[PDB]
Amino acid sequence: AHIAMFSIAAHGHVNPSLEVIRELVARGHRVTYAIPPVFADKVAATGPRPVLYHSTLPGPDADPEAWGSTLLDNVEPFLNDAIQALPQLADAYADDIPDLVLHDITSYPARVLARRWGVPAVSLSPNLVAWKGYEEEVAEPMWREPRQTERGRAYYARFEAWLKENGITEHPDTFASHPPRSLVLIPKALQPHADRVDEDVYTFVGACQEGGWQRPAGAEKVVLVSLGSAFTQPAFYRECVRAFGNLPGWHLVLQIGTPAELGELPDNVEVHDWVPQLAILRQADLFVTHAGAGGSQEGLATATPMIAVPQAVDQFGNADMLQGLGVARKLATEEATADLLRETALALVDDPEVARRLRRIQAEMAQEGGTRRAADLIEAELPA
Ligand SMILES: CC[C@H]1OC(=O)[C@H](C)[C@@H](O[C@H]2C[C@@](C)(OC)[C@@H](O)[C@H](C)O2)[C@H](C)[C@@H](O[C@@H]2O[C@H](C)C[C@H](N(C)C)[C@H]2O)[C@](C)(O)C[C@@H](C)C(=O)[C@H](C)[C@@H](O)[C@]1(C)O
Ligand SMILES: O=c1ccn([C@@H]2O[C@H](COP(=O)(O)OP(=O)(O)O)[C@@H](O)[C@H]2O)c(=O)[nH]1
């Protein structure tokens, strides 16, 4: 089959499904990938053929602030990009209409084209999705006042008119936030209101994902501290060193992203600017994490209890959810002192119920199935 994938040039909207694209190619499908030129090479590595289009969105290396800091500044760019991208893509595919459209959540043109072409669309979400009641519980209150401003009224009017020009009568919110079919590339454990998500629309597949690491001989408890790749806090690192430094039985791996700023280190502490995080987590008993999407899923994937110390807006939810699962404790940076970190660590690693819960979450993530399940489910949507 000819499967056409669509995304934007943003790491967090391309990296999550690259392996799925690779696997569909490996299985013998003809895969094309609508992508801005900066990500042509990234995409091509999968065996998919890049179909280039010009984007008006910030580049993949832009600061997070380039994407806006208000509701309308966040959403407007996706409509404006879509208005100018759609004709380029309609033109590109005109003589080679795909059998199935795959797309990241950010690509409105993919939605329009799938409908225009009369072919199935599968939305690939790298984050949480709407549950039943989301419209009344989250969307309506969030939009209530902005929608009534001249700017918000104009935005929705424009969006509706664009959809109507293209033969689409669905309300913009339905079109944007409510896909007919979706695969979700996070564990359902990190989905708010998971029991209320429509399983007829959404299927959770989890993350679709170097070097090794060896535990020091005789270490009873290994703790990894890693605040991810961006939001990486010297005072907190100092508290970590003080928490686990010279603590009998414990070995601390500290991922800092200067080692001098940390002071002289105890003998049971190893410091690195970068670590093979997954490799360490497979060999770790505790994970002190900022609760980013990757770290949170890897902690669960590896059944590693967590101290969640969220840094940025995108992490507080994950931290709350991890603690709610009974497999983590959330601390405010921040109050994350040596004494509290140590007590928290000791409580988590010794708790058999925490370990039971992690094992069950691992079992549940096994059922989600990742890359090869996502590929199986996509194939299942191919027309007869
Ligand atoms: C429920 C279903 C809805 O999903 C969300 O609410 C998730 C949970 C947002 O993240 C939430 C949560 C959070 C923390 O982002 C992960 C926050 O930053 C943003 C504002 O809203 C997403 C993904 C936002 O994207 C993010 O927008 C940022 C401006 C830049 C970021 N990027 C490219 C770097 C990008 O991923 C953004 C604006 O909603 C995407 C546009 C296309 C939408 O309006 C779409 C249609 C959504 O309404 C949705 C898919 O229907
Ligand atoms: O030293 C490091 C730092 C991070 N990572 C990986 O980088 C990703 C970080 O993603 P996350 O969403 O957790 O945090 P972000 O950097 O986006 O805030 C995860 O897959 C980590 O395993 C890694 O392998 N080694």
TrEMBL record:
Any Pfam family matching the protein: EryCIII-like_C
Gene Ontology BP annotations: antibiotic biosynthetic process
Any GO molecular function: UDP-glycosyltransferase activity
Keyword Nucleus: no
Basic and acidic residues: compositionally biased ranges: 370-384
Gene3D superfamilies cross-referenced by the UniProt entry: Glycogen Phosphorylase B
Residues engaged in binding UDP-alpha-D-glucose: 15, 229-230, 274-275, 290, 294, 298
SUPFAM superfamilies xref list: UDP-Glycosyltransferase/glycogen phosphorylase (SSF53756)
PROSITE patterns linked to this entry: UDPGT (PS00375)
Keyword check for Lipoprotein: no
Sections of the chain in a coiled coil: none
Superkingdom of this protein's organism: Bacteria
Keywords, sorted A to Z: Transferase
Cited InterPro entries: EryCIII-like_C, Glycosyltransferase_28, UDP_glucos_trans, UDP_glycos_trans_CS, UDPGT_MGT-like
Residue intervals of the Erythromycin biosynthesis protein CIII-like C-terminal domain: 260-368
Family: Belongs to the UDP-glycosyltransferase family.
Stored NCBIfam families: macro_glyco_Mgt, MGT
The protein's name: Oleandomycin glycosyltransferase
Organism from which the protein derives: Streptomyces antibioticus
Originating gene: oleD
